[PDB]
Amino acid sequence: PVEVTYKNMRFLITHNPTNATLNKFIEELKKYGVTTIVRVCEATYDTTLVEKEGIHVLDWPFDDGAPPSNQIVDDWLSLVKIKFREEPGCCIAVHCVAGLGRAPVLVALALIEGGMKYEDAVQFIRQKRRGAFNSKQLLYLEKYRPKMRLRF
Amino acid sequence: PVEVTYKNMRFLITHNPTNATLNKFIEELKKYGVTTIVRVCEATYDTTLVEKEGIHVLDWPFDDGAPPSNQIVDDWLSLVKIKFREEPGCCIAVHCVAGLGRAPVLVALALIEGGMKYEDAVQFIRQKRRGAFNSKQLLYLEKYRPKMRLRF
């Protein structure tokens, strides 16, 4: 459970909960004040229970070692533009399945789009994950050209 | 003759010289300390005379109301990355023909690539030109996604 924050954004990168640890997972997400959870991997748990706690779940999966399309980058980036202005001091959670995987990839994106050079972003995240990002993914982030349309 | 500077960059936006005002044009460019002149429009003057004063002339023309390709954006952007580090406090000149035209477009690019939002850049330039940029061009700058690979 790595937490990273920059400017007015604050993300939580967690592990896919088990069908049996789902009640605590909530209890925790609630603690960190997360109001949204984006699953960039396979979905393996009934969310009706999570949604009932006011924590909407988004499913924008994208193949590992494969850049998260363009539709996802847009929606995600836009989700960040709104959510944090919309609900001050809240947290957005992102998770995969085998553990982190590519979650970091979208948070890196928010950071870069947030005016951070890609390396700056990658380093800022490894500060908390250390094993985050693999060679294929680093390449992605390197060639990424930010829209730079997030005001602060 | 509009001069604009940001960080360690300093550009001069001039009018295409006449075959008869070429000697003074030089005398002036020399004053502003320009070491390069990029012609984004038609070429209408023998440069052998300019080159003899150590002022190399580049011809990267690009159609008006049409984005300056990608090869030009790259070379220009790269010319900026080098020249100013290469020769501290120097000036880069850019000109069209009927007057300004799209010169401003590349300087805007250097500014944005220099960490300025497009509007910030456009405003910063209008401060000195006021009539710079037309509707088609503004659109260009708006959709431009900077590489953000210029260190300062």
Swiss-Prot record, chains A, B:
**Which SUPFAM superfamilies does the protein's record reference?**
(Phosphotyrosine protein) phosphatases II
Locate the region Interaction with ATF5: 89-124
Query: Does Cytoplasm count among this protein's keywords?
Result: yes
Q: Where does substrate bind?
A: 102
**Tissue specificity statement from the Swiss-Prot or TrEMBL entry:** Brain (neurons and oligodendrocytes), skeletal muscle, regenerating liver, tumor cell lines. Expressed in enterocytes of the small intestine villi and colonic surface, zymogen cells of the stomach, proximal tubule cells of the kidney, bronchiolar epithelium, but not in esophagus and heart (at protein level).
Output the superkingdom of the source species: Eukaryota
Task: Give the free-text PTM comment from the record.
Answer: Farnesylated. Farnesylation is required for membrane targeting.
Biological processes annotated in GO: positive regulation of cell migration
Please name the catalytic residues of this protein: 64, 96
Q: What induces it?
A: By hepatectomy, mitogens, and ischemia-reperfusion.
Tell me yes or no: is Nucleus among this UniProt entry's keywords: yes
Q: What is its EC number?
A: 3.1.3.48
Q: Report the activity regulation comment.
A: Inhibited by sodium orthovanadate and pentamidine.
List the GO terms this entry assigns under cellular component, sorted alphabetically.
cytoplasm; cytoplasmic side of plasma membrane; early endosome; endoplasmic reticulum; nucleus; spindle
Keywords tagged on the record: Cell cycle, Cell membrane, Cytoplasm, Cytoskeleton, Developmental protein, Disulfide bond, Endoplasmic reticulum, Endosome, Hydrolase, Lipoprotein, Membrane, Methylation, Nucleus, Prenylation, Protein phosphatase
Tell me which residues make up the Tyrosine-protein phosphatase domain: 1-152
Location of this chain's protein in the cell = Cell membrane; Early endosome; Endoplasmic reticulum; Cytoplasm
The cross-references to InterPro entries, in alphabetical order and at most eight, read: Prot-tyrosine_phosphatase-like, PTP, Tyr_Pase_cat, Tyr_Pase_dom, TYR_PHOSPHATASE_DUAL_dom
What role does it play? Protein tyrosine phosphatase which stimulates progression from G1 into S phase during mitosis. May play a role in the development and maintenance of differentiating epithelial tissues.
Q: Which PANTHER family match?
A: TYROSINE SPECIFIC PROTEIN PHOSPHATASE AND DUAL SPECIFICITY PROTEIN PHOSPHATASE (PTHR23339)
Subunit structure, as described in the record: Homotrimer. Interacts with ATF5 and tubulin.
According to UniProt, the name of this protein is: Protein tyrosine phosphatase type IVA 1
Taxonomic source organism: Rattus norvegicus (Rat)
